[model samples]
Target: NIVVDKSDLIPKVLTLNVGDEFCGVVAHIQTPEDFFCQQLQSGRKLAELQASLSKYCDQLPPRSDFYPAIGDICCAQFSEDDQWYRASVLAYASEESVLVGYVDYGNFEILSLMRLCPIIPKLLELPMQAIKCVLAGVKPSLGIWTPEAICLMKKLVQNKIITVKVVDKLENSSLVELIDKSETPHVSVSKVLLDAGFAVGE
Candidate 1:
């Protein structure tokens, strides 16, 4: 549960030297202006911190070879706050950098290579028809939903081409199976649900 602050460093804030310890599995990336990172270890007690560090460190990927494509959803560790935020790749800059648009918050930044990690983006609740257009590989008009919702879906549709298979019929909406075009079926059903302009809860 060690949270280190490196706010003074930017442009090269993501630099991590050999043997540096950090949370390999980032649990949640905040969406605020100054994004705050909550690591999987943050929930544990301080007494057990040291013993758990190596196990988490061992989970780190062998190489930092991730290069984001335009419209790809990812989690970018912010330099200013030393936190990670859910973001969408807006453009490719170079082999080691990319422009990212934050999903939870509204902002964009050009980040370094290792700062970005690909993720199955969370879903947006939209009208049934809007979801229909998305499933058909058509970009739905944005005026119908909020700007945040529009931006989220636009990035997902362009990069993932999300497809839906109906699972069950409800009174006003139907449960659906949503999947991306990626080789692995990395789908988060909770992230993509129909609004139906009605309540459907747990």
Candidate 2:
């Protein structure tokens, strides 16, 4: 038996690669931000994070100018959607813009200096939620992912915490199999799509 608490042993920096299974809530998909998940674990759960962010965002003060270093977690606004998101400074692209990964939904962009804001210290306790992922072991029947397949996936996993097993890692995203745990017997989402004729085995 393991004496150490599992949560404590799960370090912040992880070598998450092939065959690793994790639980996360599917965030944006087939949209401007691309496909990604807000990883759910001991400290970060979906609704809890949402509630706190929304509540605190309104109370947040005006943006104060500051240049952050790489790996710094800061509050940022998505330029295209104009929505606030938690972001980690990935790089200093330019004095006016920095490359940031929206820690909530795995979106990356060069953010304007104006959009970068200081995050509340209290929220910093939560880990990065975003992880980019793609459906593994299957391909769309229509040669590429279609509207029907994407929509069906949204209906199944959006706002729900599901298990995802990694098959392979891409440059910025991972190929994974979505495990549906909503019911007693677990099911793979890719298998469902294949059976429904929306996709074929890869």
Candidate 3:
């Protein structure tokens, strides 16, 4: 995959060009402070790196709901890393039913399909623009009436509203994986992301 650098973008950075993409590798993300810095930098212009900083650093949301297609919003924390980061869905993991994610902090790296689409914006009517909010240092608004949205409107939300088998409840894994990734029925994709938005915070 192609990796981007801090200095590579010069003239190209100024224009509001479509079809542009970015990617970066987190050399080290161990602490909340370290991860927070990267999160704030994800949206600044190529030239304004030094000037862009987010005083409102928030935690990630949970995968408690069903996710929509690409362009949907969701936050991620790798089961291995335990480092929380904001993400937007770029594709669907049909096998898993989880949409892949696009993180804003540099390296627009693709992550596993999250649990739900970005919360449907109440004041705004655009789905794509809601995703852009992730890049703008604004976590999409969660449910307009729920506590989660009320609590954290700017931070990428993360909560454990959904539960899956990390280890088989029926059979143990000895060779290959056996657990299925089917999403639970009766759950609304929009609702899930909304709650997650709440977990991320303002």
lDDT of each: 0.41, 0.72, 0.30
> Which residue segments of model 2 deviate by more than 4 Å?
1-14, 31-34, 42-74, 77-84, 88-101, 107-113, 118-127
Q: Model 1 TM-score? A: 0.32
Which model scores highest in TM-score? Answer: 2
- Please give, for residues 110-133, the per-residue lDDT of candidate 1 as tens digits: 888777754421211110011111
| TM-score against truth, every candidate | 0.32, 0.61, 0.26
- In candidate 2 the C-alpha lDDT for residue 156 amounts to 77
Q: Which candidate model has the greater TM-score, 1 or 3?
A: 1
Q: Higher-TM-score candidate among 2 and 3?
A: 2
Question: Given candidate 2, what's the lDDT at residue 116?
Answer: 78
For candidate 3, write residues 1-202 as lDDT tens digits.
Answer: 2243423321111121233222222222221111211221333442232121111112223344544445544444433454443445566556455434324332244344442323312211111110111211123443233544433321322321211111111121111111111344443222444356532333
Query: Which residue pairs of candidate 1 clash?
Result: 123-191
The window of 10 residues in a row where model 2 has the poorest summed lDDT is 2-11
